[PDB]
Amino acid sequence: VWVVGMGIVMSLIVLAIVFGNVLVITAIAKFERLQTVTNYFITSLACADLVMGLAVVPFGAAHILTKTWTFGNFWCEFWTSIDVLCVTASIETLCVIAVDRYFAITSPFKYQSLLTKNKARVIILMVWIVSGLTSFLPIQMHWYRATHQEAINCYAEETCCDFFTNQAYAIASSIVSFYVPLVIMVFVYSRVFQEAKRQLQKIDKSEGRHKALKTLGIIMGTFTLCWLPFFIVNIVHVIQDNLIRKEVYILLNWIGYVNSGFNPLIYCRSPDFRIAFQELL
Numbered sequence: 001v002w003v004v005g006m007g008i009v010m011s012l013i014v015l016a017i018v019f020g021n022v023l024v025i026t027a028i029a030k031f032e033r034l035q036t037v038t039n040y041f042i043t044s045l046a047c048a049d050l051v052m053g054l055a056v057v058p059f060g061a062a063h064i065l066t067k068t069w070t071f072g073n074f075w076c077e078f079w080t081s082i083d084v085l086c087v088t089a090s091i092e093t094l095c096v097i098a099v100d101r102y103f104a105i106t107s108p109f110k111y112q113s114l115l116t117k118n119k120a121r122v123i124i125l126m127v128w129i130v131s132g133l134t135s136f137l138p139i140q141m142h143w144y145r146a147t148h149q150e151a152i153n154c155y156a157e158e159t160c161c162d163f164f165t166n167q168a169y170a171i172a173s174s175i176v177s178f179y180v181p182l183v184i185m186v187f188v189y190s191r192v193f194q195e196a197k198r199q200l201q202k203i204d205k206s207e208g209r210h211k212a213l214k215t216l217g218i219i220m221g222t223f224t225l226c227w228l229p230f231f232i233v234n235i236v237h238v239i240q241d242n243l244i245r246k247e248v249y250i251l252l253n254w255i256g257y258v259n260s261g262f263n264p265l266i267y268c269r270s271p272d273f274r275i276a277f278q279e280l281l
């Protein structure tokens, strides 16, 4: 009786993700006032979220609700390659957002001419290619496979498609896709908050007669709660095999998948954007 118990939520999630992504993309597309150097970065985020939601989630639902795929093996590798690429692209885009916000706040005088409209696009390219260097190239090679006899019936046979990783690839992907962005964001937002506190103290000193905490905390809480637990167990299993079970791993991956739907509300709020949404429909 759980056939409809689990799966309707998946349909709701995918529909919500698609609807959220398409509105942001068309709002950037069709209105002139929205275009800016910052919005170009969010455009890649929206496109990547739309691609991932349209690609990996609906097919993953079939794998969840049935024993295994009715599909091919190269398609299994293709799905596994798309998922990691999407996740790492999202992480890198968020890191770039934090960096450019820091450049804006800290040194306004040089910011106006630091980031030209043209050169900005270049950095986005330097994101995706880097992601590709960890997404398609190692998956198509033998690095995705494992040496242990268990799951050989998965990699070297047709029906099974579950994920199995060698020791090196898991830790390398975790180091290159999660921890470096986090160690960037923590320090950079600490500096931004210190600057904001200093400014508020100066304003209070000027004229006798907390927004920043909430504003940064919503984003930090959403991101850290969404993605941190997965990349602990990701290192752990590979480090030690006995501890974890598969279903918990899948659930922690899925709760991270929800971040794609969760993000646009946190990372997109402006009166101009509100007017643009109001104009549509």
Ligand SMILES: CN[C@@H]1CCc2c(ccc(O)c2O)[C@H]1O
Pocket: 080, 083, 084, 087, 088, 163, 170, 173, 174, 177, 253
């Ligand atoms: C099947 N889902 C995959 C499995 C492993 C993995 C993911 C994302 C980023 C990585 O660096 C990974 O190693 C997950 O999205």
